[PDB]
Amino acid sequence: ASPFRLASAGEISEVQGILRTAGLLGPEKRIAYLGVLDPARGAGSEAEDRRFRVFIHDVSGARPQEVTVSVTNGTVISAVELDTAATGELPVLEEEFEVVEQLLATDERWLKALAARNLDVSKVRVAPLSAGVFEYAEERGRRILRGLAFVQDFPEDSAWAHPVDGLVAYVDVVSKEVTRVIDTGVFPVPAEHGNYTDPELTGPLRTTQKPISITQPEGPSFTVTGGNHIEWEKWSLDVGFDVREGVVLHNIAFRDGDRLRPIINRASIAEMVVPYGDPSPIRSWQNYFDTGEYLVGQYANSLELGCDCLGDITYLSPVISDAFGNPREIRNGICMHEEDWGILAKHSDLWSGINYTRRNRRMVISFFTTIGNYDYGFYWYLYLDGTIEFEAKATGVVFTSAFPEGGSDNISQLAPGLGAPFHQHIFSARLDMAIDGFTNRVEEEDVVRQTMGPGNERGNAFSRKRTVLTRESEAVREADARTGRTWIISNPESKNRLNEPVGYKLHAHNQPTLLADPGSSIARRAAFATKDLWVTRYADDERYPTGDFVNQHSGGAGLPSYIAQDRDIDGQDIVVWHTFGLTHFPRVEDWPIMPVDTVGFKLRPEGFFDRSPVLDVPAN
Amino acid sequence: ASPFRLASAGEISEVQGILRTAGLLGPEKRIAYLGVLDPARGAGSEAEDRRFRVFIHDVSGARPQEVTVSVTNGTVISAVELDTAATGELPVLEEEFEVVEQLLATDERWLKALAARNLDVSKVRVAPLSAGVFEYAEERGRRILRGLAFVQDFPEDSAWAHPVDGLVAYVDVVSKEVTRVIDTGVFPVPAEHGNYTDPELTGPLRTTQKPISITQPEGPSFTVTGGNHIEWEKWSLDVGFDVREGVVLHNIAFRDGDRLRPIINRASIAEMVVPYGDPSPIRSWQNYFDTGEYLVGQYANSLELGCDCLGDITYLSPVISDAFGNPREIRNGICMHEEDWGILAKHSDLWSGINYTRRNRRMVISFFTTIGNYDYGFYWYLYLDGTIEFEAKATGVVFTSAFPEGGSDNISQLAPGLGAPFHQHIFSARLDMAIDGFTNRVEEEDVVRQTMGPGNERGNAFSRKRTVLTRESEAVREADARTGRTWIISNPESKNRLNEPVGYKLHAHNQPTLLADPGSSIARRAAFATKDLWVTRYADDERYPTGDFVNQHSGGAGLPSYIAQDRDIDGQDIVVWHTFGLTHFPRVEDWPIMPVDTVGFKLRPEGFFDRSPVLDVPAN
Ligand SMILES: [Cl-]
Ligand SMILES: [Cu+2]
Ligand SMILES: [Cu+2]
Ligand SMILES: [K+]
Ligand SMILES: [K+]
Ligand code: NA
Ligand code: NA
Known part of the structure; x- marks a missing residue:
C-alpha cells in the first residue's frame, strides 16, 4: 500500500x-x-x-x-x-542506435571513406552518438545522431581497439538521411587487438587467489517489506528505480529513540555527463549525457551472485517499459546487502582500565549499468553512525581515437597508434533535503585562520565561519579545498539538546568541475557541471539539473533556469544539487579494459543527534 | 637472513x-x-x-x-x-608520565587550586602532556611536562567527561619539581558522565545485528617468509616495525612478468602532529607530536581476533626495548590479511557479445596505537591493479575543556558545560621512492584549461601540464584541488613500451594544512605541516620531517634545513614527504566516544605497466 x-x-x-x-x-x-x-x-x-x-x-x-x-x-x-x-528532443531510443550503421552502409560518401582505408563495410561498427547543438542550422528541430567508426575483425573482437579517425558522419534518424560525411584525412587504424579474454593477451591466468567466503549464517540484518521498503540498524528508506536516473532513494530516515527522524526525502543521480576535450572536429562535438540523453536505468545489468555482488544478497528486479509499452523485467538489477566496515570506535583507557572496541558496517544499495563502452556502478551506503555516502565506480573500455604523429595535448597513447581523448565524467546528485522535516537551510562553512596578536598571542588559534544561503541568487557555490569548505544542511526550527539546529554536513571530494570554456555549448547545456553546489527551492517540475529534454537542447535548461527564480531558501523546502566528477587522462593501465576508479561524496550528522548514535552497538 | x-x-x-x-x-x-x-x-x-x-x-x-x-x-x-x-630533548619516557600527577598531589599551589574547586585530589587525574617551546626561559635544557586535570569519580569513570578548566601546571620530570601552577579562575567541572559502557547511557544494546562471517577455506593468498617478508598477488615487500614510526614498509615491488620491479624503497609515517587551536593560556601550548615526542609504535595495541581484525588474520608480534634495554614483545601488534574489494573491472560489450567481470582485492597491513585519549589506526593497502594506499583512522575520546558561557570561536559544545577545543591531526608520509630503481624525478601535474578560439573553436579542449621539480629549492609544493593537481614520480631512464618514462601518480585528499599563524612556535616546529608535498635528495641522516629530537625543540632542524641544501632531484635518489591531515571541529556525535574518521592518500601507476596489470585475474 x-x-x-x-x-x-x-x-x-x-x-x-x-x-x-x-x-x-x-x-x-x-x-x-x-x-x-x-x-x-x-x-x-x-x-x-x-x-x-x-x-x-x-x-x-x-x-x-x-x-x-x-x-x-x-x-x-x-x-x-x-x-x-x-x-529539446526526446531521449535516444535503444532502437535508433543500429540505425546509424545501417544508413551509413549504403551511403556513397561513407563507402568511399571506408574504401580509401581498405576497410570492409561489413566489419565497421558505428557508435551512434548524441549530436548536441553546434553550428548546423539544418539540425534544429531534427533528431540527429553522429557516428564514429570502429573496426571489428571478427564477431568476438573488441572494436574499440580499432578506431577509424579522421571520419565522422551525421544522420537524421527520422528522415533516414545521411546529412554530412566529414573526412579530414586518413589515420592509420590501430592494429593491436584489445581482447582481454584472449590468452595470448592475458597470459596464463593466476592460480594464486584463494577464496574469500562471506556468509551470514542467520541471514541479513535488514528487512524488506512492501517489496522495496528497507529497515536496517535504525535506518528506514524506500528503494525506487527509474529508467532515467536508475536507483533512487526515498524517505531516508533514522529511528532515534521513539522518533523516526527524516533526513533526505529523495536522493538520486539526476544527471551525468561525459564531455570530451579533444579539439579535433572528428570529436569536438562529443558530450554524452549518459543519464539525460541515454537513460542509465534502462541499461542496468543483471547482476550475478558471487560475481557482481558477494555475500548474502537480496535482489530487486525492477520493471521498465520497452519502446512499445510492454513491461520488461531487469532480473537482479539491484543488489542490497550489508558489509563489514572495519572499526567503528575504539579506546583503551589507562585511567578506567576499560578497553573498548566496536565494529562498523554499512548497508549497500547498488546497480551497474552499461552505456556503450562505459560501465558504471552506482552505490549508496548507509553507515551505523548516521553517515550517508554515494560512490560511482567507473570501468568498461575507454573511448578511443588515433594517436597523432607528433603527439597530442588532448589525447593520451594507450597502445601503438591508439589514442584516448581526454574527458570528464561529471555527476549531479539531487538531494531533496528533509533534515528533521522540510524546513531546511544551507550554510557554507569555511575554516578561518587567525592572526597572531592580542587574544591570540601564541598564534595557534583557528576557527570557522558559516554563511547562510538565503536566496537562490546566492546559492551557486564553488569548492575551496584549501579552506576546508563544506556545506551544512540544517533545520532552524529543530534543535538538539544543546540548543543548536540539527544538521548534516556535506563533504565533497573537491575534484575539478567542468573544464570547457565558459562560452562553449557544453558549458551552457551542462551548466550544472561548472559549479560544485547548487541549492534550489523545491518544485514538482524541477527534476533534472539539465532540464527534461536534454538531447539537442540549445542550452540554459535546468539549474540555471531554476536558480533565476531567486526564491527564498532560508528555512524552506529545499534541494541540494552536488556536482562531482572524474577528470580522466587515460593511462596505459586503462587499456584494454579499465580498472575501476571512483568518485563520490558523503554527508555526516552535525549535531543531528544528542550524542553518538552508536553507543548501543554490542561487542562483536 | x-x-x-x-x-x-x-x-x-x-x-x-x-x-x-x-x-x-x-x-x-x-x-x-x-x-x-x-x-x-x-x-x-x-x-x-x-x-x-x-x-x-x-x-x-x-x-x-x-x-x-x-x-x-x-x-x-x-x-x-x-x-x-x-x-632537542629526548622523547618522553613512559616512566616520566606518572611523575606529574604524583608530584602535583603534594604541591601547595595545586592543592589550593583544587580546593577552590572543591575537588578531592585523590580523584584528580592529570594528563601529562608535552611542553613544546614557549616563553619560559627556565625550561631551556630541562625536561618539562605540562599537566591538565580531569576528575575521575570512581575507578571505572571516564575522566575526560570532567575537565578542570582554568588550571595548568608545569613539571620538571628529572629534578621532580613543580615549576609553575597557573590558575586563571574556576570553571564549572562538567558533571555528566561519559561512560560508554554504562547501560544508563547506552540504553539497551541492539539485538538486530546478525553475524557476518568472513573466512578463507584454503587459507590466505599471501605468504610470509623470513618472519616478515610478504608475497601477495605480484607484490613483494618487507614489513618492519620501529618504536617511533610504527609499521614501516620496505622494498615494495611488483613482479611484472619475469621482472621484480621496485616501486617504493621505504614507506612510513615519519611524523604526526596534533596542534590545538584554543587561544586560552590553559591549552594554547598544546601540540602533540605523537610520533616524534611520544613514539607511536611503543603504544601499539594488542589486536584481538574477531574484534580488531576480522577474517583470516596473520599476526606479527614486534619486539621493542623497555627503558632498561630489555626486550618486550607487543603480542599481535600487527594485523595482515587480504580482503575483497568489490569490482575490479567490468564490461558488457554489445558488439562482441562478451560480458566480463572481475573482482578486486587488497592486502592490508595495520596496527592501532593509543596516545592518552586518542587511538589511531594506521593502515597500508596494496591493490591488485598496482595501487598503493595509506589510511589513518582516528578515534578514541576527544580532548575536552569547559565550554565558556556565551560560546567560543575555538571550542565546540559536546554536552552541558563540556567543550572540545578545535585541533588538527596532521601526518607526514615519508616515501623513499624507487620507481623501477633509484633514478627518479617528480613532476607536478595540473589540469590546463584552454580558451575558445583558433584551434579550439568549440571551446571544448582541455589539457594538462607537468613541471619537473629539478632542485630541492623548487620542491616545496602546495595542493591545488581546483586544478586537479597531482605529483608524478617517474624514472626518466626506464621507459614503457610506448617510450614514456614509467611513473606513479600521488593523489592527495587536499585537506587543509597547518592553520597556525606562520609566526607561531608550532608553525616553526611543525614546518613540514605547512605544505602538502616536499621532495628531498636521499640522505642517511634525514629520517624525520621534524628532525631527530622534537621534544622541547625549536625550529632549526628537519625539512626546512634539509631543503636548504638545494640538491639535484632530477633523476636521482629522492624522497617524497606528503603532509595530510584532518581538521577537527568536534561534533556532539563525537561524544562520549568518537566514531572513526579517516584521512590518507594513494599512488596509482601512471604508465608504469605496458597495459592493465590485471588481465590475468581469473573469473570468480
Ligand atoms: Cl572512459
Ligand atoms: Cu573516462
Ligand atoms: Cu580530533
Ligand atoms: K531552444
Ligand atoms: K655480536
Ligand atoms: Na526538501
Ligand atoms: Na629514493
Missing part, C-alpha cells in the same frame, strides 16, 4: 492500454521514457493516485508528446505536443 | 650488553629510543651489518647520548653527548 512501491509489470501494461485506447500509441509511436511520478507534497492524507509520465516519439515525423496518465483511474491526465526545436 | 627482518629479542638484549660493556648503560641510564637501522645504500649480498640506534637518557641529569651500535660486530660505532637545549 506504499505509494513509493516499485512499478509493477501490470501498471506498465495498464499505461500501455490507456495510451493505445486514447489513440496515442499508433504504429509509428515509440515510448522514449516512461516512469512513475512521486507523490505530491501533502498526499498522505490518503487516496493513492499512481501516475506515470511518458515521452512519446513518432518515427513518421509527427510531433512528440509528453503524456501523464493515471493507472489508478485509467485516464490521460494530460497530453501535450512538444516543439522540440524549443524544448 | 634478510637484513630487513624484524628486530629479535636477542638483538635487543645484545644491544643492551654492548652498551653496558661500553660503559654507556649504567643504572642511571634509560633507553628513550631504540631501533634497528636500515641497510646502507650499496647492496651487500649477505655481508650484513645489523646496526641499532639508541637515544640514552640519564635520570641524574647528566647529558644524554645518541649511540649507534653494531649488534653483528659487538661494537659501538658512534657515541655522542647531546646538548639538549640546542638540538
Whole structure:
C-alpha cells in the first residue's frame, strides 16, 4: 500500500492500454521514457493516485508528446505536443542506435571513406552518438545522431581497439538521411587487438587467489517489506528505480529513540555527463549525457551472485517499459546487502582500565549499468553512525581515437597508434533535503585562520565561519579545498539538546568541475557541471539539473533556469544539487579494459543527534 | 637472513650488553629510543651489518647520548653527548608520565587550586602532556611536562567527561619539581558522565545485528617468509616495525612478468602532529607530536581476533626495548590479511557479445596505537591493479575543556558545560621512492584549461601540464584541488613500451594544512605541516620531517634545513614527504566516544605497466 512501491509489470501494461485506447500509441509511436511520478507534497492524507509520465516519439515525423496518465483511474491526465526545436528532443531510443550503421552502409560518401582505408563495410561498427547543438542550422528541430567508426575483425573482437579517425558522419534518424560525411584525412587504424579474454593477451591466468567466503549464517540484518521498503540498524528508506536516473532513494530516515527522524526525502543521480576535450572536429562535438540523453536505468545489468555482488544478497528486479509499452523485467538489477566496515570506535583507557572496541558496517544499495563502452556502478551506503555516502565506480573500455604523429595535448597513447581523448565524467546528485522535516537551510562553512596578536598571542588559534544561503541568487557555490569548505544542511526550527539546529554536513571530494570554456555549448547545456553546489527551492517540475529534454537542447535548461527564480531558501523546502566528477587522462593501465576508479561524496550528522548514535552497538 | 627482518629479542638484549660493556648503560641510564637501522645504500649480498640506534637518557641529569651500535660486530660505532637545549630533548619516557600527577598531589599551589574547586585530589587525574617551546626561559635544557586535570569519580569513570578548566601546571620530570601552577579562575567541572559502557547511557544494546562471517577455506593468498617478508598477488615487500614510526614498509615491488620491479624503497609515517587551536593560556601550548615526542609504535595495541581484525588474520608480534634495554614483545601488534574489494573491472560489450567481470582485492597491513585519549589506526593497502594506499583512522575520546558561557570561536559544545577545543591531526608520509630503481624525478601535474578560439573553436579542449621539480629549492609544493593537481614520480631512464618514462601518480585528499599563524612556535616546529608535498635528495641522516629530537625543540632542524641544501632531484635518489591531515571541529556525535574518521592518500601507476596489470585475474 506504499505509494513509493516499485512499478509493477501490470501498471506498465495498464499505461500501455490507456495510451493505445486514447489513440496515442499508433504504429509509428515509440515510448522514449516512461516512469512513475512521486507523490505530491501533502498526499498522505490518503487516496493513492499512481501516475506515470511518458515521452512519446513518432518515427513518421509527427510531433512528440509528453503524456501523464493515471493507472489508478485509467485516464490521460494530460497530453501535450512538444516543439522540440524549443524544448529539446526526446531521449535516444535503444532502437535508433543500429540505425546509424545501417544508413551509413549504403551511403556513397561513407563507402568511399571506408574504401580509401581498405576497410570492409561489413566489419565497421558505428557508435551512434548524441549530436548536441553546434553550428548546423539544418539540425534544429531534427533528431540527429553522429557516428564514429570502429573496426571489428571478427564477431568476438573488441572494436574499440580499432578506431577509424579522421571520419565522422551525421544522420537524421527520422528522415533516414545521411546529412554530412566529414573526412579530414586518413589515420592509420590501430592494429593491436584489445581482447582481454584472449590468452595470448592475458597470459596464463593466476592460480594464486584463494577464496574469500562471506556468509551470514542467520541471514541479513535488514528487512524488506512492501517489496522495496528497507529497515536496517535504525535506518528506514524506500528503494525506487527509474529508467532515467536508475536507483533512487526515498524517505531516508533514522529511528532515534521513539522518533523516526527524516533526513533526505529523495536522493538520486539526476544527471551525468561525459564531455570530451579533444579539439579535433572528428570529436569536438562529443558530450554524452549518459543519464539525460541515454537513460542509465534502462541499461542496468543483471547482476550475478558471487560475481557482481558477494555475500548474502537480496535482489530487486525492477520493471521498465520497452519502446512499445510492454513491461520488461531487469532480473537482479539491484543488489542490497550489508558489509563489514572495519572499526567503528575504539579506546583503551589507562585511567578506567576499560578497553573498548566496536565494529562498523554499512548497508549497500547498488546497480551497474552499461552505456556503450562505459560501465558504471552506482552505490549508496548507509553507515551505523548516521553517515550517508554515494560512490560511482567507473570501468568498461575507454573511448578511443588515433594517436597523432607528433603527439597530442588532448589525447593520451594507450597502445601503438591508439589514442584516448581526454574527458570528464561529471555527476549531479539531487538531494531533496528533509533534515528533521522540510524546513531546511544551507550554510557554507569555511575554516578561518587567525592572526597572531592580542587574544591570540601564541598564534595557534583557528576557527570557522558559516554563511547562510538565503536566496537562490546566492546559492551557486564553488569548492575551496584549501579552506576546508563544506556545506551544512540544517533545520532552524529543530534543535538538539544543546540548543543548536540539527544538521548534516556535506563533504565533497573537491575534484575539478567542468573544464570547457565558459562560452562553449557544453558549458551552457551542462551548466550544472561548472559549479560544485547548487541549492534550489523545491518544485514538482524541477527534476533534472539539465532540464527534461536534454538531447539537442540549445542550452540554459535546468539549474540555471531554476536558480533565476531567486526564491527564498532560508528555512524552506529545499534541494541540494552536488556536482562531482572524474577528470580522466587515460593511462596505459586503462587499456584494454579499465580498472575501476571512483568518485563520490558523503554527508555526516552535525549535531543531528544528542550524542553518538552508536553507543548501543554490542561487542562483536 | 634478510637484513630487513624484524628486530629479535636477542638483538635487543645484545644491544643492551654492548652498551653496558661500553660503559654507556649504567643504572642511571634509560633507553628513550631504540631501533634497528636500515641497510646502507650499496647492496651487500649477505655481508650484513645489523646496526641499532639508541637515544640514552640519564635520570641524574647528566647529558644524554645518541649511540649507534653494531649488534653483528659487538661494537659501538658512534657515541655522542647531546646538548639538549640546542638540538632537542629526548622523547618522553613512559616512566616520566606518572611523575606529574604524583608530584602535583603534594604541591601547595595545586592543592589550593583544587580546593577552590572543591575537588578531592585523590580523584584528580592529570594528563601529562608535552611542553613544546614557549616563553619560559627556565625550561631551556630541562625536561618539562605540562599537566591538565580531569576528575575521575570512581575507578571505572571516564575522566575526560570532567575537565578542570582554568588550571595548568608545569613539571620538571628529572629534578621532580613543580615549576609553575597557573590558575586563571574556576570553571564549572562538567558533571555528566561519559561512560560508554554504562547501560544508563547506552540504553539497551541492539539485538538486530546478525553475524557476518568472513573466512578463507584454503587459507590466505599471501605468504610470509623470513618472519616478515610478504608475497601477495605480484607484490613483494618487507614489513618492519620501529618504536617511533610504527609499521614501516620496505622494498615494495611488483613482479611484472619475469621482472621484480621496485616501486617504493621505504614507506612510513615519519611524523604526526596534533596542534590545538584554543587561544586560552590553559591549552594554547598544546601540540602533540605523537610520533616524534611520544613514539607511536611503543603504544601499539594488542589486536584481538574477531574484534580488531576480522577474517583470516596473520599476526606479527614486534619486539621493542623497555627503558632498561630489555626486550618486550607487543603480542599481535600487527594485523595482515587480504580482503575483497568489490569490482575490479567490468564490461558488457554489445558488439562482441562478451560480458566480463572481475573482482578486486587488497592486502592490508595495520596496527592501532593509543596516545592518552586518542587511538589511531594506521593502515597500508596494496591493490591488485598496482595501487598503493595509506589510511589513518582516528578515534578514541576527544580532548575536552569547559565550554565558556556565551560560546567560543575555538571550542565546540559536546554536552552541558563540556567543550572540545578545535585541533588538527596532521601526518607526514615519508616515501623513499624507487620507481623501477633509484633514478627518479617528480613532476607536478595540473589540469590546463584552454580558451575558445583558433584551434579550439568549440571551446571544448582541455589539457594538462607537468613541471619537473629539478632542485630541492623548487620542491616545496602546495595542493591545488581546483586544478586537479597531482605529483608524478617517474624514472626518466626506464621507459614503457610506448617510450614514456614509467611513473606513479600521488593523489592527495587536499585537506587543509597547518592553520597556525606562520609566526607561531608550532608553525616553526611543525614546518613540514605547512605544505602538502616536499621532495628531498636521499640522505642517511634525514629520517624525520621534524628532525631527530622534537621534544622541547625549536625550529632549526628537519625539512626546512634539509631543503636548504638545494640538491639535484632530477633523476636521482629522492624522497617524497606528503603532509595530510584532518581538521577537527568536534561534533556532539563525537561524544562520549568518537566514531572513526579517516584521512590518507594513494599512488596509482601512471604508465608504469605496458597495459592493465590485471588481465590475468581469473573469473570468480
Ligand atoms: Cl572512459
Ligand atoms: Cu573516462
Ligand atoms: Cu580530533
Ligand atoms: K531552444
Ligand atoms: K655480536
Ligand atoms: Na526538501
Ligand atoms: Na629514493
